[PDB]
């Protein structure tokens, strides 16, 4: 089908092109980094059967910005306004444009610092197609009359 790794790599590629700061996926990197760094992960996936063969899938994607010097809070709003442009309507992966139904962001206090959380939801239909087996030709077909 449409593997999640492809979507994740596409998002990482976009963020790598646009922003100079490093992008990490695992927690040890964001702890070890000496400067502000992005964090990208898939939050939740909900699959619902709507057809005999197709499924309705909703994907929620979370992007976080963690400023380590912590004196660069205005840079957080700058990054938010820059981010808002890239993900207007849809993103393109394996040439299948996926509609973005909603955009939500919030600034909350985590631990002793303030971070930016940016989320959006994708919606698309994906289906499984089972393998087709080749059958032999039929010969010597007999019937019995029990009654």
């Amino acid at each position: 089908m449409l593997k999640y790794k492809e979507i994740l790599e596409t998002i990482i590629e976009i963020l790598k092109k646009n922003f100079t700061e490093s992008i990490f996926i695992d927690d040890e990197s964001v702890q070890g980094s000496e400067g502000s760094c992005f964090f990208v992960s898939i939050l939740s996936v909900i699959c619902t059967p709507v057809m005999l063969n197709t499924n309705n899938k909703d994907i929620v994607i979370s992007i976080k910005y963690l400023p380590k010097p912590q004196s660069k809070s205005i840079r957080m709003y700058e990054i938010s306004d820059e981010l808002n442009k890239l993900f207007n309507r849809n993103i393109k992966v394996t040439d299948r444009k996926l509609n973005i139904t909603k955009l939500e962001q919030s600034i909350k206090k985590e631990e002793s610092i303030y971070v930016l959380n940016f989320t959006f939801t994708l919606n698309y239909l994906d289906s499984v197609y089972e393998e087709d087996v080749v059958y032999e030709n039929m010969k010597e077909i007999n019937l019995n009359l029990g009654e």
Partner: protein, 136 residues
């Protein structure tokens, strides 16, 4: 043994498989007339006939319904169709097939859409007679 689920529903319309489908429904209403018999409080009824009704709901993947009837309706000639519905649940005991014949549609939806909502199309219809296949 389990109640057969509606997920495993397949519908063939005029010999072409309808890949996109959400609900199918066929029903039969009998016409009864009240008759009062002298000396009896109970009111018995007489069977006079029946009428067939049903509807189909499907996602708006393609303009399937237009090609069938749109041109013919304006000209004044009404087309009649035949539909087959097969419901085969692997958990259930067996699969049943219904042949609903002489189908006439009640309406045609040229276009319908709303911002943020996936297209959905439904079409009621009426039928006269049926044939039954693959009893359970």
């Amino acid at each position: 043994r389990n109640v057969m689920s509606g997920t495993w529903g397949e519908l063939w319309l005029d010999g072409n498989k309808v890949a996109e489908v959400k609900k199918f429904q066929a029903k039969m209403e009998f016409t009864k007339e009240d008759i009062i018999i002298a000396g009896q409080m109970g009111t018995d009824t007489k069977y006079m006939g029946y009428k067939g009704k049903g509807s189909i709901t499907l996602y708006h993947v393609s303009s399937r319904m237009h090609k069938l009837i749109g041109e013919k309706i304006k000209r004044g000639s009404e087309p009649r169709f035949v539909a087959i519905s097969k419901l085969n649940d692997p958990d259930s005991y067996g699969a049943e097939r219904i042949a609903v014949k002489n189908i006439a549609f009640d309406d045609l939806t040229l276009a319908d859409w709303e911002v943020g909502v996936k297209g959905e199309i439904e079409a009621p219809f009426t039928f006269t007679e049926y044939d039954f296949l693959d009893i359970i």
